[PDB]
Design an enzyme around this catalytic site. Sequence first.
Site, PDB file in Angstrom:
ATOM      1  N   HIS A 142       0.848  -1.199   0.000  1.00 36.23           N
ATOM      2  CA  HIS A 142       0.000   0.000   0.000  1.00 36.23           C
ATOM      3  C   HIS A 142       0.908   1.284   0.000  1.00 36.23           C
ATOM      4  CE1 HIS A 142      -3.222   2.776   1.925  1.00 36.23           C
ATOM      5  NE2 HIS A 142      -2.085   3.423   2.240  1.00 36.23           N
ATOM      6  N   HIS A 146       1.843   4.461  -3.063  1.00 36.10           N
ATOM      7  CA  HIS A 146       1.772   5.935  -2.974  1.00 36.10           C
ATOM      8  C   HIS A 146       2.929   6.573  -3.802  1.00 36.10           C
ATOM      9  CE1 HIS A 146      -1.377   6.708  -0.041  1.00 36.10           C
ATOM     10  NE2 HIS A 146      -0.807   6.052   0.945  1.00 36.10           N
ATOM     11  N   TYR A 157      -3.145  14.975  -1.687  1.00 40.81           N
ATOM     12  CA  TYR A 157      -3.534  14.267  -0.510  1.00 40.81           C
ATOM     13  C   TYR A 157      -4.632  14.940   0.296  1.00 40.81           C
ATOM     14  CZ  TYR A 157      -2.884  10.272   2.643  1.00 40.81           C
ATOM     15  OH  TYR A 157      -3.012   9.108   3.395  1.00 40.81           O
ATOM     16  N   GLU A 166      -5.646   7.142  -1.467  1.00 41.97           N
ATOM     17  CA  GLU A 166      -5.698   6.064  -0.447  1.00 41.97           C
ATOM     18  C   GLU A 166      -6.267   4.711  -0.977  1.00 41.97           C
ATOM     19  OE1 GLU A 166      -4.699   5.234   2.742  1.00 41.97           O
ATOM     20  OE2 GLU A 166      -3.269   6.807   2.302  1.00 41.97           O
ATOM     21  N   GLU A 177      -0.882  -8.698  -2.194  1.00 40.20           N
ATOM     22  CA  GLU A 177      -1.091  -9.755  -1.254  1.00 40.20           C
ATOM     23  C   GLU A 177      -1.624 -11.027  -1.937  1.00 40.20           C
ATOM     24  OE1 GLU A 177      -2.871  -8.724   2.521  1.00 40.20           O
ATOM     25  OE2 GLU A 177      -4.242 -10.413   2.337  1.00 40.20           O
ATOM     26  N   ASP A 226      -8.722  14.256   9.121  1.00 47.01           N
ATOM     27  CA  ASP A 226      -8.086  13.261   8.291  1.00 47.01           C
ATOM     28  C   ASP A 226      -7.907  13.815   6.921  1.00 47.01           C
ATOM     29  OD1 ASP A 226      -7.130  10.620   7.456  1.00 47.01           O
ATOM     30  OD2 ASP A 226      -9.182   9.909   7.085  1.00 47.01           O
TER      31      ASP A 226
HETATM   32 CA   LIG Z   1      -5.018  -7.996   3.657  1.00 36.35          CA
END
Ligand SMILES: [Ca+2]
Length: 316
Positions: A142, A146, A157, A166, A177, A226
């Site tokens: 992840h 970016h 952002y 994001e 994964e 955020d």
């Molecule tokens: Ca996962």
Amino acid sequence: ITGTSTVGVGRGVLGDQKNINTTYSTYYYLQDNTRGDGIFTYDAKYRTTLPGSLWADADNQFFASYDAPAVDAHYYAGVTYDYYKNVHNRLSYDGNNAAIRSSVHYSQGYNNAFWNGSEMVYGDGDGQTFIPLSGGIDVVAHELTHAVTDYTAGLIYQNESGAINEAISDIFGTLVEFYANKNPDWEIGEDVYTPGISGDSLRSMSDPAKYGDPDHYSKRYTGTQDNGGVHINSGIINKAAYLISQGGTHYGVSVVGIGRDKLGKIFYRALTQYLTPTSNFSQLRAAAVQSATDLYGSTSQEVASVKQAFDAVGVK
Ligand SMILES: [Ca+2]
Ligand SMILES: [Ca+2]
């Protein structure tokens, strides 16, 4: 460092053994000469000054508790580099084989990891909320994504563009994964989050609302925290991406899945050819539709599924 390429062995955060690519010059360094211009991992020795020292080890064996997070940061960056190269034909984050650098043991009890515009940084966690963050391949991938975004679409952002940024990172971290086949899921950070609690994770792409994130544009967050909800409103896009891949009915809108591989192809093309720094959700829909169109033809099911998915999350 200039030396001889070799291979060492260690144990990662989860206790799993793995081989890593090192460089020998008096010490064995965590420097992997096999990928692009190199993958380099550094020790930030609990401080916040970066990058810290290039990781040196005396015997090429990385079984100490203190070594775990470096082993995984180093290894997982190799996997991520492999995914981009093999799957999308992209050489490192910049497309020109830039060196990948990471620092571990950043600060004390730091519960986060991030790409700072130049390198990766990983905290060890406080041991309660998180364990060392590089133990999660979705987290590593992840963060590294970016960097891909920075070199490409450059999504600012904050607000919608930030949530796009994001969601892209979560999408690709999840695709990596699955690529590595490491107990894959549609959850984010499950492997390093809340060691005492089984079954949870930081975010869910399959059901964002499980952790209180929106799964429909109508429920979007409009305040200022955020950075305008980059980690909240990403759930809307994450949910759309889940549906494109897997299919389902969401708020009575039915989507036929087209699978992970196509999901990754469409998204990568959107990101690299169509998105811009200020892109909003609505522009993302257009980018994705156009990419699928490019790739599969306008009267394709692929195109159809992309439309249905965004309709389902209320993105017009
Ligand atoms: Ca996962
Ligand atoms: Ca947990």
